[PDB]
Symmetry: C2
Subunit: 383 residues, 2 copies
């Protein structure tokens, strides 16, 4: 006859992890808090350190006959709040106003992470039967690099999964596919000369311009001819540029960076080879070269929309939730590089328009309901 | 039986104006020095102030019957010396080593200016006959803006000239034509959006790229089809660029600057209209616009190579000097906007490769000879 966890504690746990400022760092403080919570309920977590102060957390709960393994994942970092004077309620204070809990990370994605941890605890304490294992994977650095997701995948922590739910904010929709993301840099080398007698120089800005023209034309042709039924066309933008040193000097250096959002129908390998090809055609017959560097490279993700995991989730509702795609990357871009196929979906509480925005909040009733819905999902999937 | 000016004084005058650091300013100190020198020899100059501390100097000497007016012009500013540790001899110390007098401005163009002033004084004191007037026009700010040249032309000080020599460093060649120079800026306005969902934005870098492609192609077509017999083809380079604020944001601002060197066969009016046309074609059907600003606009210069002034100069030599053109602008780009035609040439002492360079020097024998050659030129032209 063990006591239930009360509503006020479920809310306080979320507030206390929001108040841990974990902007591109400090995830070890969030992991320690959640590992201490799990220990209060006789679940022993495993800390997997990324770097000083930045720790991932893994935890398992098994019951019944050896069966499938269901992973529940979320990230512990958040994006910067920006100018805090612009917020109505302070971003790391986790204030409650009515049904809203305000704070950076309330929607993206400390509510989903807390809901997953509490769902595991309540699953255990409910004593309800199932046959398999549920595994938490709480990651470092999803927002800038998917650092923990890559670390855990390379280490082997995804190898036993039959299915994975990532608790990013989808509200009541199931995101089963999302785009990839590439950030790249092109650097252009030239030779200085005075603008009045330029023949001994080489204009680095001109050579960079020729890359922009050709890459834009090739990427637009790719958008016009190939598309994904859910995610749309490949996206490409040059987003930063610099070059030159004085108005009357031929520029000896220029550089740009750009962002691409990719789809399975024309994958990252092909995009990078295409960019490299363009650089190669433009470097013919000169010793003043463009050079391509890939700074970020996250693959598209596409799961089976009819998987047993998705069926187990839809079984929790009197009407099926919408299946959707999204543009932004998630830690699935790293976990899906594991050397086997697993069922996958993104499903988490939150307000879909508010990740990374001023005055971010989550709806308390949504958060509390997802604690219960995760338990139902686990019990169905692991039946 | 008045005393001659000795060689050592002619050299000391040049050293003392080189030691007045007049980098884009302080020309009033050079003007005051030269006006005091003229007064020691009973020539009264006229100070024409540009701004506090930046004064032009005009002086006249007449003899005989009213006749032609010959102008002698030079500028009193110099370009920056840069890192002085890179110089072998300190740039504002005017040290003499053998036949070389080292210093910023020694070649460009304090030697020509001092030689013109001394030539006027010696012309007067020689008592040699002529019929007309020789007029010094010593200007502020030739290197950045041709400020004094424009001021004096607008005021009316060029209106009486029949001929003009500018004493820039040509060594023993006669520069009778030079290119124009335009510096321009193009600013591109767009709209911010996240790189993952860019449809509500507008990429300012892309629109700027389209300007570079079209302006480069039109300017190259102009180079390939039109040329000047002495000055060559029109030159165009984009030399500075910037744009964007974050790699995952569609850029809302971008800008470039560029430099053009123009020829009489396709003059500045036409170049500016062509650039504007390109901006206009590219702004069709959008509210996110490119904008053109002209920052510098100096016209080409072309004199009569067979003028009486040139004949008077060639009469000083047993073999004619080469007639040449040059790429760089001079104050003639402002003086030739006077509302009448005058004979023109650039002829001055100096080492042609050294304007604006480290370890600039002038050859002392070249400087002293030009003091004498200017007097001969005046006496012939004003015979
Ligand atoms: Zn997230
Ligand atoms: Zn996020
Ligand atoms: Zn000069
Ligand atoms: Zn100069």
């Amino acid at each position: 006859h063990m006591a239930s966890m009360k509503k006020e504690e479920k809310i306080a746990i979320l507030q206390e992890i929001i108040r841990i400022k974990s902007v591109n760092g400090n995830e070890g403080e969030v992991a320690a808090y959640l590992n201490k919570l799990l220990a209060r309920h006789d679940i022993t977590g495993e800390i997997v350190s990324y770097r000083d102060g930045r720790d991932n957390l893994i935890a398992r709960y098994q019951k019944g006959q050896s069966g499938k393994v269901l992973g529940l994942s979320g990230h512990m970092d958040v994006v910067a709040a920006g100018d805090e004077s612009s917020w109505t309620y302070a971003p790391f204070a986790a204030e409650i106003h009515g049904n809203r809990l305000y704070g950076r990370g309330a929607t993206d994605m400390k509510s989903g992470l807390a809901a997953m941890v509490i769902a595991m605890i309540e699953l255990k304490e409910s004593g309800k039967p199932f046959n398999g294992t549920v595994k938490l994977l709480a990651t470092v650095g999803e927002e800038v690099g998917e650092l923990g997701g890559e670390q855990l995948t390379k280490a082997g922590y995804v190898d036993d999964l039959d299915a994975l739910i990532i608790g990013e904010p989808t509200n009541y929709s199931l995101m089963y596919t999302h785009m990839g993301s590439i950030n790249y840099t092109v650097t252009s080398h030239g030779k200085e000369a005075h603008s009045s007698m330029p023949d001994q120089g080489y204009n680095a800005i001109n050579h960079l311009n020729e890359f922009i023209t050709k890459a834009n034309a090739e990427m637009n042709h790719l958008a016009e001819t190939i598309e994904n039924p859910v995610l749309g066309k490949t996206i490409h933008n040059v987003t930063l540029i610099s070059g030159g040193n004085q108005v009357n000097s031929i520029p000896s250096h220029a550089q740009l960076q750009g962002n691409i959002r990719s789809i399975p129908e024309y994958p990252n390998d092909k995009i990078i080879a295409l960019l490299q090809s363009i650089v190669n055609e433009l470097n013919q017959e000169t010793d003043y070269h463009l050079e391509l560097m890939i700074d970020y490279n996250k693959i598209p993700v596409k799961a089976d929309p009819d998987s047993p995991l998705i069926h187990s989730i839809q079984q929790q509702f009197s009407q099926p939730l919408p299946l959707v795609g999204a543009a932004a990357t998630t830690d699935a871009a790293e976990f899906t590089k594991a050397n086997h196929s697993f069922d996958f979906v993104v499903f988490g509480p939150g307000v879909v328009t508010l990740p990374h925005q001023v005055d971010e909040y989550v709806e308390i009733d949504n958060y509390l309901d997802m604690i219960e819905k995760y338990q139902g999902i686990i019990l169905s999937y692991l039946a």
